[PDB]
Amino acid sequence: TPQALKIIVPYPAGGTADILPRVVAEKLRAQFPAGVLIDNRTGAGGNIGAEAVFRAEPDGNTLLASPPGPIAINHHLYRKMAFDPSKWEPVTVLATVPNVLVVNPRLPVKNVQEFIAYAKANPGKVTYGSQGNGTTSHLTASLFMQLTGTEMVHVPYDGTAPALVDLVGGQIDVFFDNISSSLPFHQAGKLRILGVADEQRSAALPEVPTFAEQGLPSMNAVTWFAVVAPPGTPAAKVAALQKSFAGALTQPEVQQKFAEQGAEPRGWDPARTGQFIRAESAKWDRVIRSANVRLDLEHHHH
């Protein structure tokens, strides 16, 4: 008898991890008359909510919709975890979204090179927020520091939303967020985006140069928002779910809300999604080792 589709998002409401599945869910209600429920489950950089899905019954009624940390990245930083992301059953990728460098407006910097010089002038003093250990914002900051020889202080939060509160407030200095969540802040001059970590500019921010344009072509850091099912979820179930998500993503209300905030809808099939997750896991391993990425197991609140 009918069950609501339960989607855990392992980050606080407000950021891109929460908004993209919520936008999609509005057009899935069609194939799920009992409802599509988003359940935010915060902490440990995404791992609390991930654990909850990993142990859920593998019937495809409980899914994780997450950015890369608890899917492709975290397992490279934790020697002992409570779940094994290699055992997720991939469903789809909802979207890819480039990361950016975004700064508090009172920082006296107008581009990436001026920020490099400012961090060198203040070695070990500039703070970068992150969305949590092993999130793309954490690793993107690490990459930047390796490529530029800068030394900054990690201030981990539990997702984008609390990090942006403190960035706007001036309690931290910089953050390597994704463009979608930082965009409205930049548009209103509440934050300043200095560069886009992709090979082309974003159509959502056509006036902001890439990092490649500004002298750092290895700053390619495009995050993504995937859906995974518990270990053992049947292949035919993951296939049907992917088809439903793909259909929602082509609905003009969804497509259009993604595109307006610089998110590229994907809708990839399960096997393509698995291949992509493994490639991304290998890509971020290389960053972790090259940039000597370390955990910060102290907690921060906005």
Ligand X SMILES: O=C(O)c1ccc(C(=O)O)cc1
CB of 68 to ligand X, least distance (A): 5
Distance CA 127, CA 125 (A): 6
DSSP letter at 56 equals S
**Interface residues for ligand X in 37-76 (CB under 6 A)?**
67-69
Contact 17, 65 (CB under 8 A): yes
What Å distances lie between residue 222 and 3, 58, 99, 130, CA to CA?
Answer: 34, 30, 6, 15
CB of 110 to ligand X, least distance (A): 25
Establish if 160 lies at the interface with ligand X (CB under 6 A).
yes
The CB-nearest residue to ligand X is 15
**C-beta closer to ligand X: residue 13 or 240:** 13
Strand, coil or helix: 198: coil
Nearest CA to 60 out of 218, 206, 233 is that of 233
CB of 99 to ligand X, least distance (A): 7
In the numeric block, the tokens 């809808």 are attached to 265
Distance CA 66, CA 154 (A): 22
List the one residue from 5, 7, 17, 112 that touches ligand X (CB under 6 A): 17
Q: How many residues bind ligand X (CB under 6 A)?
A: 16
State the binding string over 106-145 for ligand X (x if CB under 6 A, else -).
Answer: -------------------------x---xxx--------
Contacts of residue 268, defined as CB under 8 A and 6 or more positions apart, other chains included, come to: 92, 93, 242, 276
**C-beta closer to ligand X: residue 66 or 233:** 66
**Interface residues for ligand X in 217-236 (CB under 6 A)?**
223
Establish if 96 lies at the interface with ligand X (CB under 6 A).
no
CB of 36 to ligand X, least distance (A): 19
Q: Are strands 89-98 and 222-229 parallel, antiparallel or unpaired?
A: antiparallel
Establish if 11 lies at the interface with ligand X (CB under 6 A).
yes
Contacts of residue 49, defined as CB under 8 A and 6 or more positions apart, other chains included, come to: 8, 9, 10, 11, 40, 41, 42, 43, 64, 66, 70
**C-beta closer to ligand X: residue 136 or 148:** 136
**C-beta closer to ligand X: residue 76 or 118:** 76
Contacts of residue 91, defined as CB under 8 A and 6 or more positions apart, other chains included, come to: 63, 226, 227, 228, 229, 238, 241, 242, 245, 270, 273
CB of 225 to ligand X, least distance (A): 7
**C-beta closer to ligand X: residue 60 or 257:** 257
Establish if 159 lies at the interface with ligand X (CB under 6 A).
yes
Which residues form the interface with ligand X (CB under 6 A)? Answer: 11, 15-18, 67-69, 131, 135-137, 159-160, 178, 223
